[PDB]
Structure 1
């Protein structure tokens, strides 16, 4: 019943809270703010992830430990790595990878850490729900691997590495760490991304509002 909602764009949080139309208590924790509301007999906890893998790991672990969320939906933007994945497309992550993990000094494959795995899994059930919602709304939902790392990726060389090494379709900075924490705690997680590059501000205000609606649509089925 307890549902966590994370946005990688801080600008999306208010649209989300407003759309749900219930009272949210602001609860400070670990230098972030978590918004707690009750919506149709569910606790809904909403937060901005903050930027990068340490911030987003902290936020997600805090959300799970302090509030006991049982499912997590994570919205945000991503850069495309493939020609067919265009600006404004919606992408659900089937798997994620931390693209900047490198223990090659010990002859490990890139992306791999001992006692872990290169690829991070996401929720089949939630992904199918996102697909159901997109289908109903006649939105094309694309699926693929999302690569995340603490660098903003822009060079052709690095983009080609992401595609060749990890078969990544898109890249951003928080998805993998959030999905990772959820996996460690046995919490179903869905990572959804609007493709923002292949006006930024104009793109964002529109994208943030449609994302809020999409997330609520999912929660209304949960």
Structure 2
């Protein structure tokens, strides 16, 4: 059968995923993560939260691919908005991702760039198109854009402005670029889906605490609607 990996960063991002699928799961620990393995609509679904940030998410994605043999990875979670048109609860899919905190400018490399890699990492056009189709049929707004990932929770106007000017990012989070990077290295289709929890400004901690649960649920519900069409 088809094997689909489903990832969040925090436990709160996968709790609604496990509940919404509503099937039994076997828990399999590996590399400090717990993988929930279930069968849903004739597909094997493997659900896990990575824990926060780039190292955690790189490890979990690599484990999913190498140890569980998943054929697609769908990431669902929350994100900070960098643009006026992405408001609390709104959904976006990443067309490209960047590691916004990478800085080898001492050697005149562009910010975000590492030798033998690239600034922007692409996701699956096919999965992004599926998301768009579903969103239109459900009459849900869905934006497509660049997501910036780094190992800092962004809560300042100055950092937002940098992300917009340097990378033209629409949202910020801490895991998407690493998940997409790993998938691309192994030829595995990847979709990164996020629901806005905050505006990545001085009020972001507050907003995040308020909206984590609801925004996570919104993302999870949409991810399920995608899996229903795969």
**Same fold by TM (over 0.5)?**
yes
Residue 200 (structure 1) shift: 4.3
Instruction: Identify the residue that residue 65 of structure 1 maps to in structure 2.
Output: 66
SS at match of 1:43: strand
Instruction: Output one character per residue of 1:24-73: Cα deviation in whole Å (capped at 9) or x when no partner.
Output: 11000001100011122211000002101000000100111110101111
Structure 1's 80 and 12: CA in aligned 2 closer, same or farther, altered over 3 A? closer
Contact 2:197/2:215, CA 8 A, preserved across alignment: no
Structure 1's 202 and 151: CA in aligned 2 closer, same or farther, altered over 3 A? closer
Instruction: Output one character per residue of 1:66-105: Cα deviation in whole Å (capped at 9) or x when no partner.
Output: 1010111101111111122211111111100000111112
CA RMSD, Structure 1 to Structure 2 (Å)? 1.4
Residue 107 (structure 1) shift: 1.4
Structure 1: distance between partners of 2:227 and 2:155: 34
**After the TM superposition, which parts of structure 1 deviate over 6 Å for at least 4 consecutive aligned residues?**
none
- TM-score, with normalisation over the residues of structure 2? 0.92
- TM-score, with normalisation over the residues of structure 1? 0.95
> How many residues were matched structurally?
222
Structure 1: distance between partners of 2:149 and 2:99: 5
Contact 2:26/2:36, CA 8 A, preserved across alignment: yes
Instruction: Identify the residue that residue 213 of structure 1 maps to in structure 2.
Output: 221
Residue 11 (structure 1) shift: 1.4
Contact 2:98/2:120, CA 8 A, preserved across alignment: yes
Structure 2: distance between partners of 1:216 and 1:99: 29
List alignment gaps of at least 5 residues for structure 1: none
SS at match of 1:163: helix
Deviates more, 1:201-210 or 1:23-32: 201-210
